[PDB]
Specification:
Chain lengths: 156, 294
């Protein structure tokens, strides 16, 4: 069981300081952005991280959301990353969820953050270069020390 | 080799060589590609090889040599059915500084932690004659002219504006690409593992019909949560109330957090039931349980 606690505004960045944003096609992407660029592209660059209480605690249970013409929530349904048109729910009556992720700092680096899927164990939110784009994808951990599954969240 | 400009809004400084690359370069291999500009309600115009002596149209990129204030506007690219839009905002150059303040990328680094600045420009490196690194418009002497690099453990004195200036040539004319980093050195956040104060299993003697305030306290970090689990899956006992959190900062800058679960009108339904209090963090979680007994 998950119960919505509180939400915060955050700027998610990969370990290359590339700002995560939802583009015109509602795809989550990563791009180098000057402070001005990050602001001028807001709200596409501003994410609502919502904390949840967990029935069986296993790290900080959160939902990543974005507020454009409509509020969309990040989902990893079928191991495929998408932004479902919905608000973070008040309640979740399951121990696993396509929208719940476990935010965990990396051991020794309290600023480097990883997001484990509650539905697909050992599957993490990651930045992958696909063609001339940096895409937000779901990836299995693989080799320990993987910097692609590590992020930084900047709060206001 | 260079990534496409996928973001919708772009901010550039006047007099700097600028480009915007579309996100279908492999596609640009199958004469059926066009670039357009729309000035303040001008309802677009098709750009051509010599529309402007500064604008160079290529299959994947639209080069500006250099970009100037009159270039501010909406740009649209069309290849068969692929379409891409950019809102270009050319800002005025601070001719009194070595960089415009409105074109900085801020970075906060914790004191004594690794700190590195590297000057690189993948796109124009073929035309780059020299590249210099300045700290608050004072040229630093780092042997490298190609990629001046600072690699050290951060100190409060390292705070400052680091500008990478890439000097290059295009048909005799000299230009530069300045990129500034606003570094801010802060004290070590030194996060702790959240710890719930008191024993893991607590038995609290109560009497039916009366009320009870189950106190839960922890030592945690500013961004950590403390909450109670008392069976809210399809509505909890209406007599159970989770009180407002209380926090007192420790001298070490950490927090003493308190959350009280108030069980009013105690009944048999509250007895021999585990009421859990958890502390949750990016650094770990910890739960303690309370049992109500006669
Ligand atoms: C990357 O490239 C950009 C260009 O793409 C470089 O930008 C140049 O930066 C310098 C400063 O770093 C600027 O110079 C300053 O201009 C200030 C204001 O200038 C005004 O008056 C000018 C008057 O006319 C002058 O130029 C014409 C030729 O155009 C001459 O014929 C004439 O005799 C004059 O000399 C105007 O033209 C201009 O538009 C402005 O309205 C000045 O306040 C400033 O003064 C410094 O130097 C003084 C001595 O000359 C000194 O006493 C002062 O204390 C002070 O230090 C300085 O001249 C350039 O204007 C600017 N050019 C552009 C196109 O933006 C950038 O430098 C480069 N990066 C690096 C690191 O090289
Ligand atoms: C949780 O902590 C609170 C304190 O924050 C404890 O409450 C305190 O409970 C005692 C009795 O158990 C109260 O003291 C005495 O009781 C009478 C009752 O009529 C009261 O009026 C007098 O103050 C008297 O000294 C005390 O007032 C009360 N304080 C508060 C703020 O309610 C509570 O017992 C702790 N819970 C557990 C499970 O230990
Ligand atoms: C309060 O906690 C007990 C104990 O739960 C254990 O510790 C938790 C922190 C978490 O990690 C649980 O998964 C652990 O089981 C809860 O009781 C357990 O409930 C689960 C699921 O209903 C069940 O599989 C276990 O057998 C139960 N264990 C015991 C000792 O009863 C209890 O449900 C929690 N109370 C509330 C109000 O949610
Ligand atoms: C930087 O470039 C110069 C040459 O630039 C010329 O002058 C500019 C103003 C512009 O008109 C450019 O298109 C010109 O090409 C390099 O200088 C030459 O270098 C050789 C050795 O490699 C030397 O023997 C010559 O005397 C130089 N020639 C001239 C005309 O200056 C210089 O090496 C370049 N710097 C670096 C570090 O690459
Ligand atoms: C350089 O970075 C610092 C830190 O991010 C910026 O300082 C902040 O400025 C705002 C107002 O603009 C204040 O409300 C904050 O309290 C400041 N923070 C600190 C830690 O001082 C600074 O503005 C940045 N400079 C530029 C030119 O962007
Ligand atoms: C654009 O502005 C520059 C000066 O900043 C000028 O030299 C150029 O001719 C202008 N071009 C057009 C088409 O307005
Ligand atoms: C372009 O057309 C192809 C089919 O020919 C289609 O699969 C593709 O999705 C289209 N691209 C866009 C951006 O609509």
């Amino acid at each position: 069981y998950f119960g919505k606690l509180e939400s915060k505004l955050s700027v998610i960045r990969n370990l290359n300081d590339q700002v995560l944003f939802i583009d015109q096609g509602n795809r989550p992407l990563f791009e180098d952005m000057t402070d001005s660029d990050c602001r001028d592209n807001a709200p596409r660059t501003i994410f609502i991280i919502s904390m949840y209480k967990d029935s069986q605690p296993r790290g900080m249970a959160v939902t990543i959301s974005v507020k454009c013409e409509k509020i969309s929530t990040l989902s990893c349904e079928n191991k495929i990353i998408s932004f479902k048109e919905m608000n973070p729910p008040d309640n979740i009556k399951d121990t696993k969820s396509d929208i719940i992720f476990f935010q965990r700092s990396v051991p020794g680096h309290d600023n480097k953050m990883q997001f484990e899927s509650s539905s697909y164990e050992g599957y993490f939110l990651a930045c992958e270069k696909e063609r001339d784009l940096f895409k937000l994808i779901l990836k299995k951990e693989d080799e320990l020390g993987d910097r692609s599954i590590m992020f930084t969240v900047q709060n206001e | 080799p260079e990534s496409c400009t996928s973001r919708p809004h772009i901010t550039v400084v006047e007099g700097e060589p600028f480009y915007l690359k579309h996100c279908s370069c492999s596609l640009a291999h199958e004469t059926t590609k066009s670039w357009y500009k729309s000035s303040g309600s001008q309802e677009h115009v098709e750009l051509n090889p010599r529309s402007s002596s500064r604008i160079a149209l290529h299959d994947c990129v639209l080069e500006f040599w250099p970009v100037e204030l009159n270039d501010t506007g909406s740009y649209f690219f069309q290849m068969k059915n692929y379409t891409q839009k950019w809102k270009l905002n050319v800002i005025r150059r601070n001719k009194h500084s070595c960089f415009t303040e409105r074109q900085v990328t801020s970075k906060i680094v914790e004191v004594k932690k690794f700190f590195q600045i590297t000057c690189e420009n993948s796109y124009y490196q073929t035309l780059v004659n020299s590249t210099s690194l300045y700290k608050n418009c004072k040229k630093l002497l780092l042997e490298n002219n190609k990629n001046p690099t600072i690699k050290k453990n951060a100190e409060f004195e390292d705070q400052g504006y680091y500008s990478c200036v890439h000097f290059l040539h295009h048909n005799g004319k000299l230009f530069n690409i300045t990129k500034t980093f606003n570094i801010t050195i802060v004290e070590d956040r030194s996060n702790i593992v959240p710890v719930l104060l008191g024993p893991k299993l607590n038995h609290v003697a109560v009497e039916l019909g009366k009320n009870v305030r189950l106190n839960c306290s922890a030592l945690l970090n500013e961004e950590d949560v403390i909450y109670w689990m008392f069976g809210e899956e399809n509505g909890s006992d209406p007599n159970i109330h989770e009180e407002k959190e209380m926090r007192i900062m420790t001298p070490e800058g950490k927090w003493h957090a308190s959350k009280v679960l108030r069980i009013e009108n105690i009944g048999e339904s509250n007895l021999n039931v585990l009421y859990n209090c958890t502390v949750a963090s990016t650094g770990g979680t910890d739960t303690k349980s309370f049992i109500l007994v006669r």
